[PDB]
């Protein structure tokens, strides 16, 4: 959490190596947060105020006292905001989606709702194209001048 | 005496180049330990700077 923060705080495009022109545009935040605790919250949000960008950016935050299937929602909420954002008023967006273990926990509970034949370790078959459509909502458009750039977090689990 | 005198002025000729090396040893020490006395000053206004501007960018943004 804190080398993401410390990107988001600190991550700028160079125009002096490129020759663009400065005309420098900030990044947009769309903060997605998918059963942090409230020690990470804190966190964030102290850092966001701190360094100034509560102002750019757009937080999505599930707690983890929240019911567990939101979780479901929440990245896409995220993205569908990135994508407005990003392609209709030219922003230069960066979406941080924290903690994709816990939105894949969060499907796994569902897919095991259902009896759906799993992959391995019990997580369902179609897994992949859920991250797909997930992270394949990311990148820049010809003719355009916005654009999404994700840092999703994983916690892998016997790491 | 005067024979005795320019014996111990010849030493000291000898006392007073070692009271010069001695003094120019003083100096070259302190020259500097006043410039690094005076950079710390600076680097210290400038830091203290710092913080003034992102106090001042961070009051007007809330
Ligand atoms: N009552 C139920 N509740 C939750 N999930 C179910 C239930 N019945 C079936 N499913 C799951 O959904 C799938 C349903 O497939 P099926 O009923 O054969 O055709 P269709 O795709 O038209 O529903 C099954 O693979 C099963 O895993």
């Given at each position: 959490?804190?080398?993401?923060?410390?990107?988001?705080?600190?991550?700028?495009?160079?125009?002096?190596?490129?020759?663009?022109?400065?005309?420098?545009?900030?990044?947009?935040?769309?903060?997605?947060?998918?059963?942090?605790?409230?020690?990470?919250?804190?966190?964030f949000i102290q850092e966001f105020?701190?360094?100034?960008?509560?102002?750019?950016?757009?937080?999505?935050?599930?707690?983890?006292?929240?019911?567990?299937?939101?979780?479901?929602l929440t990245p896409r909420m995220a993205l569908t905001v990135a994508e407005y954002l990003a392609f209709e008023h030219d922003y230069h967006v960066l979406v941080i989606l924290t903690d994709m273990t816990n939105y894949c926990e969060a499907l796994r509970e569902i897919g095991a709702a259902r009896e759906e034949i799993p992959g391995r370790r019990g997580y369902p078959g179609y897994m992949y194209t859920?991250?797909?459509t997930i992270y394949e909502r990311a990148g820049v458009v010809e003719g355009k001048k916005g654009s999404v750039?994700?840092?999703?977090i994983l916690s892998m689990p016997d790491d | 005496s005067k024979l005795e005198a320019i014996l111990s002025q010849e030493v000291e000729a000898e006392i007073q180049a070692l009271l010069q090396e001695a003094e120019a040893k003083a100096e070259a020490v302190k020259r500097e330990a006043e410039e690094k006395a005076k950079a710390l000053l600076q680097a210290r206004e400038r830091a203290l700077e710092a913080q003034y501007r992102a106090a001042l960018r961070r009051a007007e943004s809330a």
């Open positions: 959490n804190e080398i993401a923060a410390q990107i988001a705080r600190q991550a700028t495009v160079r125009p002096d190596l490129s020759g663009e022109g400065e005309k420098e545009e900030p990044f947009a935040v769309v903060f997605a947060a998918m059963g942090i605790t409230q020690r990470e919250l804190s966190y105020e701190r360094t100034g960008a509560l102002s750019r950016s757009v937080l999505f935050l599930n707690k983890a006292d929240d019911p567990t299937i939101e979780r479901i859920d991250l797909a750039t994700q840092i999703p | -």
